Design a protein around this ligand. Structure first.
Ligand code: FMN
Ligand code: SF4
Ligand code: SF4
Ligand code: SF4
Ligand code: SF4
Ligand code: FES
Ligand code: FES
Ligand code: ZN
Lengths: 83, 80, 26, 210, 24, 263, 106, 426
């Protein structure tokens, strides 16, 4: 159901709660949204990742897209960068 | 590697039940004296607090790092 | 023109030749 | 600085010192103090480089084996020094000195000429795998500034054209008169020998008493 | 410009041994 | 006999000949800010974050290294030994990747504190940063080594406390990366201690990757039952489930180290 | 924008909350990234200080403009990650405009 | 006042001109009083250098006699050793390449003359690996000498025993450092050791060891043959003796002349070598001791005399005495910039200050050459410069800071204009 698949179960004593009232779950789960994000190709060995917008983005981090074997992923945006 | 939190003695009450809460899954505790840790400068003073307040105590001796001899020249010894 | 021509092993092989002269080890 | 095993550069490439090489190996050890072999890793690593320029991961493991040292110990030595090459090296492997002394005396000048002659970027091997150009740092011999060391040849005082001439010599034929292609012997004031133009005093000249 | 229900979203912290359904 | 008298800010402590300047400050009670110096690991002098100023001396000395001599008064809070720390911390931080909200050694950082107490209010490194390539050291230690301050305590422990002799420095300059040259996992018992001994959060624990953050963890001191050495350990519990078990020092039994099994 | 929730579970929003309102527990998502399994703001506990808005490095938790969220039952006021993320999606356009207007000041 | 006589010039075989080999060396009479000297005593040899008051011929200047005196203390059961560093990574030090290549023998007897002074069991010569051909020359020379029996056990028909070895360098400037030469000799990575355990007490293979610039070892025999006084007279006060001077860059005839020390800087380009290319007024600056020492602008050049202390008074170091000259035709901002590039490609990275600091100055210096950086940054570089000067484990960080300090000290207006130039074109 939800992000980490919370599933109060058919036998749980808590699934009682939703009776006559819906559960809060999310469409466009994020888990798949960045996976849906194209790999940002770059020329330089290392690249930055302001998160987009500087102050409005995230701590600026420099990722080492040095091995095509792996597309660097800024630990903050989950954006893969293709050397 | 800082040692500024290994200076003052503390006496801490025994840990008690921490059952999960059914509605939100938050930890729930029925023991009032759980989060209380009083800080006492010396072993003698802390023992006194337990005796007059009537709580049972089991003091643990301070164990401080033993002096260790170090010298940059010593490891350069091919011999050993 | 000795400087002008030497082989890749000149240093090492020459040394080995000198080994006999080399005084006993510690 | 990471050896990602590759079919070419990985231990499948067996390495072993030629019967002649192994000989060289041992004498070196004795050069160093007895009970001390580890000290010979560099000199040995150098003979692995003498054997083969590539010196792959397999070769370093053998070095550690022959020298009975932690393998990493050899890996650290190879990575620290520029003399060792952990990647294939061009037959000629020219290196151009570009520190300020040579640059002030035009070192950069030479570079442009060599890139065009080899018809290749600076830092990689020619397709013919004939020459490899690299911008190395001070190689000593500054008095003669324009300079390009080629497998120890250490040509010196070279004007752009001279190199093209040298490269051609390398491209067809061999041993292109390595050295200062100038008219000054070793290092000498181009004017002459102001330092000592007289004859050298003989043995026991003005030897102080006592 | 030109009723919710609260719940814990975490998993089971302490998984529980299940008895063998094979009788012995 | 064998008791020199050295002054730490004029406190006339007396120390056996051969005690380091850092050690002299310890008995008075002062702490030299230190990285790359661990009590049971060899002195290396890599960081030089411990530069202090012996009185009447032209240059500042390396605390962890200089054997204190006769009657040299250490000035640990001078106007100089603070510019010798305000300027080193400038450097460690300059090439550092600011992912402190990723670095799970968030509150367990001996590099933010020393910055936050002995370092500088602001940065002047308007230039660009460096990045190294994360590799695999095994299934227990996550080496996000772009964090590494090249303090060489791992290479020591991995050679001196444990006899692995695998981890080593590779290269020179600002791209000296302290990782295995070929990717061979660091498989040995005593392996997890590297986590505890790297003050930076470059290599940390992979299971306890992001489950917690240290201020929250309630710490109860208990005993190792997995093995019969009975190593002392601290069980870090949050809201009632154990989150990590890390070593607590017992001179005689486990002196700051615990097995890969019991953590 | 891409669709990846901003929070990276550094959990200092929990540290600086004066009322102990925010409860966060996290684990590495399969992607390998760091995300919060449970983020629960107890709004009845919250005193709307706005420090969480302040503290977040990625600025994932924000004080949204809406003030009209009065609820019939006490449980509705307790908010888990899904309600807040849903609240975030609904008011993102205005939240973005508001942060746009005030970020130079901060 | 320089102008040393050819006779006094110790390295006659300089420039070759005389068989570098033994028979040329015998006509040189380099092995003339070797048996006598060793016979006199180790104490007699150190008396000779103490009287000479010779200063270190390598970049660092220290009394040579006192340094050798330190390991003259009684052996503690570990063999004492001699290490001769023929590495000269510093730009403009083709100074040593001469003695090694042209007059290998002088250094061979320098080694044994020096050896009995310290009672060294054996001497290892670390010639930079770059010089492969150079190595070929010395061991040919070393081989000759033993064949003669000049070196080896019972060397020179005397009780004393010595063995001389040559070690391959591997293209590292830092290998040159005294504690790091040892580690390369030891076979570990070339990373300077720390200062407290002085190389006398600990050292190569952990035995007592001493390190000398090849010029320092080579001048030993003569200093003993000619006596400390003869040598002592040429120098100035603490400064003393002739030291080879290499002039490279923007001079009509760049050459290494062993003319006397205490030479007016204006005189050595004007009188020997070649007058500054383009005229003595076409001198934007002079690098007296090589890249490590700060450059001095023409303003003081003429007044300056080439001595270890002289340059000190001047805020610069005699160092390797490598004179690098820059005409008014050079972008100094870029000249010094490549020396910082020279040091980022070379420092070991063992110590935090040098590792990040030298890279930090390299990044700022490259921006300075472009002029992209603002005028205020200049002072920071200075401030960054002294953080690295006093905090480094070895002297290379000492060395990286000085050229940066020199550029700001005398050429601050030019860098500001490069600052200004870029700001104007936007
Ligand atoms: C980075 C660095 C590089 C050095 N390179 C050399 C060198 O190439 N040759 C040399 O003789 N000394 C070099 N030195 C100085 C040596 O460490 C040592 O002080 C000197 O060789 C001693 O010679 P002397 O005492 O006879 O003058 C270097 C020092 C440093 C810090
Ligand atoms: S180590 Fe982790 S926590 Fe300590 S500073 Fe670097 S990033 Fe922030
Ligand atoms: S890993 Fe941790 S310990 Fe090993 S060097 Fe980098 S920082 Fe020092
Ligand atoms: S909300 Fe902002 S602060 Fe609280 S955890 Fe997620 S990111 Fe860190
Ligand atoms: S300064 Fe620090 S880094 Fe630069 S060389 Fe000497 S030790 Fe290695
Ligand atoms: S810099 Fe080119 S040889 Fe000295
Ligand atoms: S702590 Fe002073 S040397 Fe690392
Ligand atoms: Zn990002």
């Amino acid at each position: 159901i939800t992000h980490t698949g919370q599933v109060y179960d058919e036998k749980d004593y808590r699934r009682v709660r939703f009776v006559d009232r819906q559960k809060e779950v999310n469409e466009n789960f994020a888990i798949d949204l960045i996976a849906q994000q194209p790999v940002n190709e770059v020329e330089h060995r290392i690249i930055a990742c302001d998160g987009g917008g500087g102050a409005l983005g995230h701590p600026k981090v420099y990722i080492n897209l040095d091995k095509e074997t792996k597309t660097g992923t800024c630990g903050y945006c989950g954006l893969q960068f293709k050397q | 590697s800082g040692v500024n939190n290994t200076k003052k003695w503390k006496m801490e009450f025994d840990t008690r039940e921490r059952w999960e809460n059914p509605l939100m899954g938050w930890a729930s505790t029925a023991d009032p004296l759980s989060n209380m840790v009083l800080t006492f400068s010396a072993k003698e003073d802390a023992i006194a607090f337990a005796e007059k307040n009537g709580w049972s105590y089991d003091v643990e001796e301070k164990k401080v790092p033993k002096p260790k001899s170090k010298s940059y020249g010593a490891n350069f010894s091919w011999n050993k | 023109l000795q400087h002008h021509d030497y082989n890749t092993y000149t240093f090492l092989d020459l040394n080995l030749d000198l080994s006999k002269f080399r005084l006993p080890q510690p | 600085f990471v050896h990602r095993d590759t079919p070419e550069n990985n231990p499948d490439t067996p390495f072993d010192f030629t019967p002649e090489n192994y000989k060289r190996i041992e004498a070196i050890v004795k050069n160093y103090p007895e009970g001390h072999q580890a000290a010979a890793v560099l000199p040995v690593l150098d003979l692995a480089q003498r054997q083969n320029g590539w010196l792959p991961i397999s070769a370093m493991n053998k070095v550690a084996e022959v020298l009975q040292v932690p393998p990493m110990r050899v890996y650290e030595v190879a990575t620290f020094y520029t003399m060792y090459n952990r990647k294939p090296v061009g037959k000629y492997h020219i290196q151009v000195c570009t520190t300020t002394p040579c640059m002030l005396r035009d070192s950069d000048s030479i570079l442009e000429t060599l890139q065009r002659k080899l018809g290749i970027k600076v830092g990689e091997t020619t397709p013919d795998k004939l020459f490899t150009l690299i911008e190395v740092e001070c190689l000593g011999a500054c008095v003669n500034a324009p300079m390009v060391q080629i497998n120890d040849n250490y040509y010196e005082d070279l004007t752009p054209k001279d190199i093209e001439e040298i490269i051609d010599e390398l491209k067809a034929g061999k041993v292109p008169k390595p050295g200062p292609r100038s008219g000054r012997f070793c290092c000498e004031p181009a004017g002459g020998l102001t330092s000592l133009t007289e004859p050298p005093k003989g043995p026991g000249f003005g030897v102080q008493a006592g | 410009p030109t009723q919710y229900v609260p719940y814990s979203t975490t998993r089971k912290k302490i998984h529980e041994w299940v008895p063998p359904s094979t009788p012995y | 006999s064998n008791l020199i008298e050295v002054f730490v800010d004029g406190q006339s402590v007396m120390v056996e000949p051969g005690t380091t300047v850092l050690q002299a400050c310890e008995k008075v009670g002062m702490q030299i800010p230190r990285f790359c110096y661990h009590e049971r690991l060899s002195v290396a002098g890599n960081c030089r974050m411990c530069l202090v100023e012996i009185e009447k001396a032209p240059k500042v000395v390396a605390a962890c290294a200089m054997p204190v001599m006769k009657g040299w008064n250490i000035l640990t809070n001078s106007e100089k030994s603070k510019k010798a720390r305000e300027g080193v911390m400038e450097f460690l931080l300059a090439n550092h990747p600011l992912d402190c909200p990723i670095c799970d050694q968030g509150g367990e950082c001996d590099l933010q504190d020393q910055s936050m107490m002995f370092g500088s209010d602001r940065s002047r490194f308007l230039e660009g940063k460096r990045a190294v390539e994360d590799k695999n050291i095994g299934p227990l230690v996550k080496t996000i080594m772009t964090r590494c301050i090249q303090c060489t305590r791992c290479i020591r422990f991995a050679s001196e406390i444990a006899g692995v002799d695998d981890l080593g420095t590779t290269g020179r300059g600002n791209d000296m990366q302290v990782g295995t040259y070929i990717e061979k996992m660091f498989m040995s018992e005593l392996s997890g201690n590297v986590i505890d001994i790297c003050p930076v959060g470059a290599l940390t624990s992979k299971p306890y990757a992001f489950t917690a953050r240290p201020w929250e963890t309630r710490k109860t001191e208990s005993i190792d039952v997995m093995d019969a050495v009975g190593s002392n350990i601290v069980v870090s519990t949050r809201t009632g489930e154990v989150m990590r078990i890390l070593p607590r020092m017992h001179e005689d039994i486990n002196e700051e180290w615990i097995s890969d099994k019991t953590r | 924008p891409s669709g990846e929730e901003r929070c990276i579970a550094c959990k200092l929003c929990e540290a600086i909350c004066p009322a102990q309102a925010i409860t966060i527990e996290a684990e590495p998502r399969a992607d390998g990234s760091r995300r919060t399994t449970r983020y629960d703001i107890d709004m009845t506990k919250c005193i709307y200080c706005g420090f969480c808005q302040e503290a977040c490095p990625v600025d994932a938790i924000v004080e949204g403009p809406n003030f009209e969220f009065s609820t019939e039952t006490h449980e509705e006021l307790l908010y888990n990650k899904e309600k807040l993320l849903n609240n975030g999606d609904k008011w993102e356009a205005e939240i973005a405009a508001n942060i746009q207007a005030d970020y130079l000041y901060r | 006042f320089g102008s040393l006589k050819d006779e006094d010039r110790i390295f006659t075989n300089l420039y070759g001109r005389h068989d570098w080999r033994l028979k040329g060396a015998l006509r040189r009479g380099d092995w003339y009083k070797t048996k006598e000297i060793l016979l006199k005593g180790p104490d007699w040899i150190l008396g000779e250098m103490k009287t000479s008051g010779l200063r270190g011929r390598g970049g660092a200047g220290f009394p040579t006699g006192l340094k050798w005196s330190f390991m003259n203390k009684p052996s503690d059961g570990r063999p004492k050793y001699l290490v001769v560093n023929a590495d000269e990574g510093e730009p403009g030090t083709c100074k040593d390449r001469e003695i090694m290549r042209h007059d290998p023998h002088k250094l061979v007897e320098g080694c044994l003359v020096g050896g009995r002074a310290m009672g060294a069991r054996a001497a290892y010569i670390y010639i930079r690996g770059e010089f492969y051909n150079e190595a070929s020359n010395l061991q040919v020379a070393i081989r000759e000498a033993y064949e003669a029996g000049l070196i080896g056990k019972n060397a020179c028909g005397s009780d004393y025993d010595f063995d001389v070895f040559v070690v391959r360098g591997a293209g590292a400037y830092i290998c040159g450092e005294e504690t790091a030469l040892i580690e390369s000799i030891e076979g570990k990575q070339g990373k300077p050791r720390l200062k407290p355990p002085f190389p006398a007490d600990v050292g190569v293979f952990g035995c007592p060891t001493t390190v000398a610039n090849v010029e320092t070892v080579a001048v030993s025999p003569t200093i003993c043959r000619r006596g400390g006084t003869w040598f002592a007279g040429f120098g100035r006060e603490r400064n003393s003796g002739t030291k080879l001077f290499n002039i490279s860059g923007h001079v009509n005839h760049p050459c290494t002349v062993e003319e006397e020390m205490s030479v007016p800087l204006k005189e050595l380009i004007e009188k020997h070598a070649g007058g500054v290319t383009g005229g003595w007024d076409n001198l934007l600056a002079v690098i007296p001791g090589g890249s490590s020492t700060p450059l001095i602008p023409k303003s003081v050049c003429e007044t300056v005399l080439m001595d270890f202390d002289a340059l000190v008074q001047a805020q610069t170091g005699l160092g390797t005495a490598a004179v690098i000259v820059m005409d008014r035709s050079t972008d100094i901002v870029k000249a010094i910039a490549r020396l910082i590039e020279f040091y980022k490609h070379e420092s070991c990275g063992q110590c935090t200050p040098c590792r990040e600091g030298v890279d930090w100055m390299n990044k700022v210096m490259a921006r300075f050459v472009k002029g992209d950086a603002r005028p205020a940054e200049i002072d920071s570089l200075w401030e960054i410069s002294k953080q690295i000067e006093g905090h480094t484990i070895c002297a290379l960080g000492d060395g990286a800071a000085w050229p940066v300090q020199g550029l700001i000290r005398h050429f601050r207006p030019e860098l500001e204009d490069r600052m200004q130039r870029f700001a104007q074109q936007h």
